[PDB]
C-alpha cells in the first residue's frame, strides 16, 4: 500500500513538468553549445545537461 501511495505521489510530482519540446540536431557545436532544429520555431544552439 505504501509503495503504491509513494509511486502515485512522485508521479504527481513529475506531472508538473512541462512538454520539453522536440528537437533534432543538424550539427553539434562541441561541448555544451550544440545546434538543434525544433519543429515550429527555427534553429537554436542549446547546452546539454549532465549526460
Amino acid at each position: 500500500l505504501n509503495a503504491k501511495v509513494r509511486l502515485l505521489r512522485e508521479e504527481l510530482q513529475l506531472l508538473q513538468e512541462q512538454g520539453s519540446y522536440v528537437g533534432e540536431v543538424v550539427r553539434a557545436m562541441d561541448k555544451k553549445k550544440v545546434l538543434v532544429k525544433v519543429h515550429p520555431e527555427g534553429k537554436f544552439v542549446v547546452d546539454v545537461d549532465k549526460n
Binding site: N2, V5, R6, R9
Partner: protein, 469 residues
C-alpha cells in the same frame, strides 16, 4: 579528557576547504566542538581565526557558543575565562550561552552571576543566549527566583528571547511536575502569537513533566488534542520523556497512532522521533518497529524514523539500525539524508570496523558527501555534523541515556532531545554535549590516589584498540 585529547585534525583540514563557504561552514564550527568537547582545545579555532569572520550574525553566536562545549566542565576559571576569550550582540550572547554550557547540570554559584548578568541584559539576542545558558546551568534546580526571572523574560513576548525562555523555563523546573509552572507555560502558549515562543514552550512543557510516568496523562489528553500543531508536538515531547525509559504500552500506542494519523507533518515527525526516548531501554525492538515508518511516502515520517532510530540505539552498534540507515542515506529528499547521517553518527561513535563492519565505509561516505560541490546544503550539514559526532571528545565520550548502573541518565536524554530541535534552531546543537559521558575508568581509591594500573583488554581476534589512525 585533557590528557587523552587525541582528536584528529586532518579530517577538518580536508573539510574546511571542502565546504564552499555555505552556511554549513558554520556547522563545522559545531562539528569540531563535538570532537574537542571538554578538551578545552580551541587550537582549531586558533589555526584559523579569520575564517570565523565569515560567520557573522547568529553563526558567530553559535561559533562563540562553540567554546562553551569546548570547555565542558572546566569550572576552574570559566567566569573570567569566557571574558578572556570574548571580551556585537551575537558575540556576547553566545559567550553567555557558552558560560552556561561549561556549567551544564552543575550550577555552582554561576547561577547567581547569571541571575545578575541577565537582568542587566538588553532584552535582546544577549538575553536569548543568557537565558539558554542560565536555564541549562540551573537545570532541575526548581529554584523559584530563577523561575520567575525566566517568567518575566518570557512575558517580554519577543520572538527570540521567548524562544530561549521556552527552553530555559522547562530546564529550571525539569521533571518537577510543577503545576504552577506548567500552567503558566501552557497559558502563555495558548496566548502568544510568535511561533518561536511556541517552539520553545513545546520543549519546556515537556521538560517540566520529565519522568512522571502516568502522572503525565492529565497533560497528554490536553496537548494531544489541542488544535495548535506546536502544542501537539509539545504533547509528543511530553509523552516521550514522561514515559522515558519504560517501553510503556500506552505511550507507544498513543504516539505511534498520532504519528501515522495526524494531519500536520511536524507532529508526525516529532511523535516518531519520541520513540527513541521510550524504547532505548531495549534498543533491539526499535528496528523491528521503525522498519516500516523508515520507508513511508511521507518524508517527515522518514526523517523522524531516522532520528528515532539513532536516538533509540544510542551509541551502541545495533547493526540492524545501520542496515536500515544504509539505503536511507541515499534517499532523494535532502533533509531525510541529513537525518540519516545524524542517526548513523549517533550510533557509530567510538567504534572500529571490526567492532561494527560499517564504520569505515560510513566515514568515507561522509567524506564524499561533505566534499561534493553540488550536493544539497542540508545533506552536507548532516554530513559535517556526523563527522563531529563520530570522533566526539577525542573518541573518548559516548552517548547513553542508560547510566552504567541501569538508571536513566537524565542530562543525556534532555540534551539529546533539545539537540533534535536543531531542525528549528541551529544553536541548540551544543546541547548534545549533555549526552557525552566519558568512557574512562578511574582507579582512584584514597584522596588523590591515582596510581598507574596494569589492567588490560582481552582482544580475542586481534588488536584494534583506538580508532582514527
Amino acid at each position: 579528557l585533557i590528557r587523552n585529547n587525541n582528536t584528529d585534525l586532518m579530517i577538518l583540514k580536508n573539510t574546511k576547504d571542502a565546504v564552499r563557504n555555505s552556511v554549513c561552514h558554520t556547522a563545522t564550527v559545531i562539528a569540531n566542538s563535538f570532537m574537542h568537547c571538554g578538551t578545552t582545545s580551541d587550537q582549531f579555532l586558533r589555526d584559523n581565526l579569520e575564517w570565523l569572520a565569515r560567520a557573522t550574525n547568529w553563526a558567530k553566536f553559535t561559533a562563540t557558543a562553540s567554546l562553551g562545549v569546548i570547555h565542558k566542565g572546566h569550572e576552574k576559571e570559566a567566569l573570567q575565562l569566557m571574558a578572556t576569550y570574548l571580551p556585537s550582540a551575537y558575540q556576547e550572547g553566545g559567550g553567555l550561552y557558552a558560560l552556561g554550557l561549561i556549567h551544564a547540570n552543575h550550577g555552582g554559584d554561576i547561577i547567581d552571576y547569571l541571575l545578575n548578568q541577565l537582568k542587566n541584559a538588553s532584552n535582546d539576542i544577549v538575553r536569548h543566549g543568557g537565558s539558554l545558558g542560565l536555564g541549562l546551568a540551573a537545570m532541575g534546580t526548581a529554584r523559584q527566583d530563577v523561575y520567575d526571572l525566566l517568567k518575566t523574560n518570557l512575558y517580554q513576548d519577543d520572538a527570540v528571547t521567548g524562544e530561549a525562555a521556552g527552553l530555559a523555563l522547562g530546564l529550571v523546573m525539569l521533571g518537577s511536575k510543577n503545576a504552577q509552572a506548567i500552567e503558566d507555560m501552557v497559558g502563555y502558549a495558548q496566548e502568544t502569537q510568535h511561533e518561536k515562543i511556541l517552539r520553545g514552550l513545546a520543549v519546556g512543557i515537556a521538560l517540566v513533566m520529565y519522568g512522571r510516568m502516568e502522572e503525565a496523562d492529565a497533560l497528554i489528553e490536553s496537548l494531544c488534542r489541542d488544535k495548535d500543531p506546536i502544542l501537539r508536538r509539545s504533547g509528543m515531547y511530553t509523552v516521550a520523556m514522561a514515559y522515558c525509559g519504560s517501553g510503556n504500552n500506552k505511550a507507544i500506542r498513543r504516539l505511534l497512532h498520532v504519528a501515522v494519523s495526524d494531519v500536520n507533518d511536524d507532529v508526525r515527525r516529532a511523535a516518531v522521533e519520541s520513540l527513541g526516548f521510550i524504547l532505548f531501554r531495549t534498543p533491539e525492538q526499535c528496528p523491528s518497529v521503525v522498519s516500516l515508518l523508515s520507508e513511508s511516502y511521507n518524508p517527515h515520517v522518514r526523517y523522524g524514523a531516522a532520528m528515532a532510530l539513532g536516538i533509540c540505539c544510542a551509541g551502541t552498534g545495533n547493526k540492524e539500525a545501520i542496515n536500515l540507515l544504509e539505503p536511507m542515506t541515499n534517499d532523494p529528499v535532502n533533509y531525510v539524508r541529513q537525518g540519516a547521517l545524524i542517526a548513523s553518527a549517533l550510533i557509530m561513535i567510538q567504534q572500529t570496523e571490526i567492532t561494527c563492519p560499517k564504520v569505515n565505509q560510513f566515514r568515507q561516505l561522509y567524506s564524499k558527501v561533505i566534499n561534493d560541490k553540488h550536493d544539497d546544503v542540508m545533506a552536507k550539514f548532516g554530513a559535517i555534523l556526523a563527522q563531529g559526532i563520530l570522533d566526539a571528545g577525542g573518541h573518548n565520550v559516548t552517548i547513553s541515556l542508560q547510566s552504567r548502573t541501569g538508571h536513566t541518565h537524565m542530562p543525556s536524554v534532555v540534551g539529546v532531545l533539545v539537540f533534535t530541535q536543531f531542525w528549528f534552531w541551529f544553536p541548540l546543537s551544543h546541547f548534545l554535549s549533555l549526552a557525552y559521558t566519558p568512557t574512562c575508568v578511574i582507579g582512584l581509591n584514597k584522596d588523590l590516589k591515582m596510581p598507574k594500573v596494569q589492567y588490560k583488554s582481552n582482544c580475542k581476534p586481534s588488536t584494534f584498540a583506538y580508532p582514527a589512525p
